[PDB]
Amino acid sequence: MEIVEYPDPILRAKNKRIDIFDENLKNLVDAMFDVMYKTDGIGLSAPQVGLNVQLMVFNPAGEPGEGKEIVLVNPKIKKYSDKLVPFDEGCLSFPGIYAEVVRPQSVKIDARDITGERFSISLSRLPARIFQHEYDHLEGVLFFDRMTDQVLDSIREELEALEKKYEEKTGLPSPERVEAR
Numbered sequence: 001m002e003i004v005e006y007p008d009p010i011l012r013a014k015n016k017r018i019d020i021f022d023e024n025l026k027n028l029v030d031a032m033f034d035v036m037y038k039t040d041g042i043g044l045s046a047p048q049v050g051l052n053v054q055l056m057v058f059n060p061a062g063e064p065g066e067g068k069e070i071v072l073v074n075p076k077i078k079k080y081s082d083k084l085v086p087f088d089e090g091c092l093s094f095p096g097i098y099a100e101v102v103r104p105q106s107v108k109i110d111a112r113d114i115t116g117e118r119f120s121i122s123l124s125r126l127p128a129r130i131f132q133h134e135y136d137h138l139e140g141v142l143f144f145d146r147m148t149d150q151v152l153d154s155i156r157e158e159l160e161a162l163e164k165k166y167e168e169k170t171g172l173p174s175p176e177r178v179e180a181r
């Protein structure tokens, strides 16, 4: 397996609805959780492992045998809180890069579980925070898109190093560039 890193276009591509809730889905969810634990994450989205599908997993404890292994399929945000809060985020698609992101404190959500049963849920605190980060991935939105210009400027060179890596590996110019913004 391989975590897909910025600026790979897979991270910007449209993600398809999941219609089939079967063993292949369960296997993928397991693999994603295992990637998360191996890499010290607290959540992961399907495009980050190379699959453009509306699937996210997370565990707000981030540790084996702790917290809850939360799976959300075809999620939709129904409401964001007016209240905003800052929090330092990293993203497994941007190794080593951490910066302040301001997001709504809480969200109301519609999604499906791993069996395909639909549910409504309200999230707050860290779970809300993780959720919105992973939800943005499913919408082809990356965390620096959410940063202020001042915060973005502080990570520009780190982002360009990732653009260079992609350019060196592929021999192609990067399909997006932080400087364009």
Ligand SMILES: CCCCC[C@H](CC(=O)NO)C(=O)N[C@H](C(=O)N1CCC[C@H]1CO)C(C)C
Pocket (backbone or CB within 6 Å): 039, 040, 041, 042, 043, 044, 045, 048, 087, 088, 089, 090, 091, 092, 093, 129, 130, 131, 133, 134, 137
């Ligand atoms: C907070 C918003 C959720 C972030 C989810 C990411 C994983 C990811 O890229 N999901 O798409 C993560 O685990 N990031 C970690 C992260 O940001 N953490 C881990 C503990 C708390 C926070 C740092 O303040 C590390 C790997 C950089």
Ligand SMILES: [Zn+2]
Pocket (backbone or CB within 6 Å): 001, 002
């Ligand atoms: Zn591999």
Ligand SMILES: [Zn+2]
Pocket (backbone or CB within 6 Å): 030, 031, 034
């Ligand atoms: Zn496993």
Ligand SMILES: [Zn+2]
Pocket (backbone or CB within 6 Å): 040
């Ligand atoms: Zn750890």
Ligand SMILES: [Zn+2]
Pocket (backbone or CB within 6 Å): 090, 091, 092, 093, 133, 137
């Ligand atoms: Zn991420």
